[PDB]
Amino acid sequence: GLKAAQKTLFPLRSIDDVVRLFAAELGREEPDLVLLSLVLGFVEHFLAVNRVGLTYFPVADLSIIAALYARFTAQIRGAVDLSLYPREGGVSSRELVKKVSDVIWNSLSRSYFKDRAHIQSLFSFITGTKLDSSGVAFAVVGACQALGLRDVHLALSEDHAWVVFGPNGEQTAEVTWHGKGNEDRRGQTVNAGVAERSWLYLKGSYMRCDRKMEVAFMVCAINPSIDLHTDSLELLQLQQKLLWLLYDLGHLERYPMALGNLADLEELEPTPGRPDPLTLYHKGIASAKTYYRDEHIYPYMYLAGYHCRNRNVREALQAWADTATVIQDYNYCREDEEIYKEFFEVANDVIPNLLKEAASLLEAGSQGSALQDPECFAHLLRFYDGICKWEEGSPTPVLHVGWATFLVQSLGRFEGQVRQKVRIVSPVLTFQSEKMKGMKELLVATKINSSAIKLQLTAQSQVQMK
Numbered sequence: 001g002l003k004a005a006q007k008t009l010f011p012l013r014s015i016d017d018v019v020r021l022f023a024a025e026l027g028r029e030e031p032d033l034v035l036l037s038l039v040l041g042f043v044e045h046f047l048a049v050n051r052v053g054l055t056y057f058p059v060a061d062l063s064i065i066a067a068l069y070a071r072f073t074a075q076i077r078g079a080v081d082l083s084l085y086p087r088e089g090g091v092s093s094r095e096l097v098k099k100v101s102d103v104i105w106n107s108l109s110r111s112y113f114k115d116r117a118h119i120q121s122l123f124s125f126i127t128g129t130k131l132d133s134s135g136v137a138f139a140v141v142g143a144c145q146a147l148g149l150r151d152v153h154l155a156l157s158e159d160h161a162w163v164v165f166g167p168n169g170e171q172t173a174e175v176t177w178h179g180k181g182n183e184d185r186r187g188q189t190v191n192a193g194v195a196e197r198s199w200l201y202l203k204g205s206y207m208r209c210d211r212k213m214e215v216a217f218m219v220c221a222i223n224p225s226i227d228l229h230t231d232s233l234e235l236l237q238l239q240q241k242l243l244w245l246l247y248d249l250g251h252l253e254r255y256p257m258a259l260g261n262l263a264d265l266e267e268l269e270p271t272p273g274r275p276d277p278l279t280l281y282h283k284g285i286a287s288a289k290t291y292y293r294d295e296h297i298y299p300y301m302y303l304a305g306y307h308c309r310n311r312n313v314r315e316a317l318q319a320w321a322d323t324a325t326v327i328q329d330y331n332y333c334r335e336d337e338e339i340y341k342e343f344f345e346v347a348n349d350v351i352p353n354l355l356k357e358a359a360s361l362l363e364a365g366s367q368g369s370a371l372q373d374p375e376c377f378a379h380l381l382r383f384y385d386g387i388c389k390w391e392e393g394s395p396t397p398v399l400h401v402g403w404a405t406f407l408v409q410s411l412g413r414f415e416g417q418v419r420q421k422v423r424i425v426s427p428v429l430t431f432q433s434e435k436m437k438g439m440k441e442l443l444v445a446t447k448i449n450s451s452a453i454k455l456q457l458t459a460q461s462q463v464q465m466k
């Protein structure tokens with residue numbers, strides 16, 4: 001290092017002292033990713049993993065943080081001999097990047113639960129020799145910064161992380177694993193994934209971080225959870241304040257998911273004088289439209305969740321229709337299973353529960369119910385249209401008869417006289433999927449023909465012998 005100027009704020013005795021440290025680092029030429037991740041992991045450990053002895057805030061003494069920092073930098077500098085990997089042009093080589101990745105990978109415990117909480121930070125790596133998937137990628141970038149490799153940066157999709165490096169920052173390399181039971185492609189480019197138009201690689205519209213965005217990533221990576229039923233209020237407040245610091249300095253401009261995280265925190269505990277959660281969700285969507293060709297799913301899912309929690313059924317349906325309008329221009333590939341799981345839960349659990357409560361409230365006399373609004377029926381239909389269009393030309397199918405039962409049920413929550421008011425043109429809606437085009441006639445009849453719907457959604461050829 002640490003440099004004298006980095007040590008002057010220690011000891012850190014409060015959340016605000018941690019915010020001051022981040023402010024100071026973010027004001028430097030290069031914020032120190034290693035320092036910052038160790039501090040966050042230290043504080044998270046003593047606020048979320050082990051709170052024994054806690055009276056206010058775990059004091060971060062310079063002696064403790066400097067020793068962790070020395071362990072990390074000694075481990076990396078000792079194992080990576082830069083003289084074996086000459087750098088032309090102030091840029092790194094694939095071989096060097098792969099070496100840094102191997103060094104991190106080879107340091108990890110042979111066997112542990114990869115999906116647990118609080119194994120994201122360099123604190124976890126040094127004290128537990130444990131990292132989660134994206135934590136390995138972050139640790140590679142931190143190590144490269146420690147080594148003076150200014151061109152190596154974190155690349156992020158909505159379910160994976162890797163690195164960019166090299167001339168013009170144009171090279172990509174895998175540095176960590178993805179999912180469970182996938183074969184690792186460490187060392188390789190991400191071009192085959194981009195070319196196949198999978199969600200995992202976002203058609204190439206993934207985030208290419210600068211150092212400031214990498215700070216934002218580690219802040220998003222804070223995990224306030226103590227257990228299933230309990231969050232650390234101290235860690236929530238710290239994450240919230242750090243995200244505001246980043247927001248004010250301009251560093252969330254290109255980070256849709258961080259804006260959604262901040263909005264969720266503001267919903268929980270609003271900060272006086274700040275934009276409402278809805279404003280922030282909309283800024284996340286604007287960020288994705290501006291910088292990422294509107295190819296991201298999570299900006300709309302964050303918005304839909306907020307409306308769902310607040311029982312704004314119309315607005316929740318509209319936001320989920322929007323999620324599907326993004327997904328329809330992807331191919332569903334092996335390794336996209338996480339987004340399949342989220343669409344499945346929305347279609348087959350969340351929407352049914354929302355419409356079930358809506359139906360009870362309609363029986364109880366509600367006015368302006370989404371169930372009496374044809375535009376809400378149109379959103380439900382656009383949702384299914386997008387999922388069906390996603391499935392077209394994909395190497396793996398999406399829909400099956402499990403989805404059909406819930407579709408029939410959800411359609412049935414709207415009376416015939418409401419469904420009839422939607423105009424399906426080749427309230428007005430156009431279908432992109434051949435499945436929904438063929439279902440059009442079925443969608444307005446007073447009694448929904450359940451078996452014909454099922455056949456059209458699953459493209460089931462035949463009916464029972466017997």
Ligand SMILES: COc1cc2c(cc(C#N)n2Cc2cn[nH]c2)c(C)c1CN1CCC(Nc2ncnc3sc(CC(F)(F)F)cc23)CC1
Nearest residue numbers: 134156157158159160161220257258301302304305342345
């Ligand atoms: C499974 O998680 C969710 C599902 C969600 C929602 C909102 C909705 C809705 N509607 N859903 C779907 C759902 C709702 N109920 N049941 C499912 C939300 C808000 C979430 C919460 N997740 C939103 C995305 C957030 N992810 C991130 N947030 C910031 N940065 C990054 S970088 C990255 C890739 C990497 F991990 F590094 F490999 C991921 C990621 C993690 C938390």
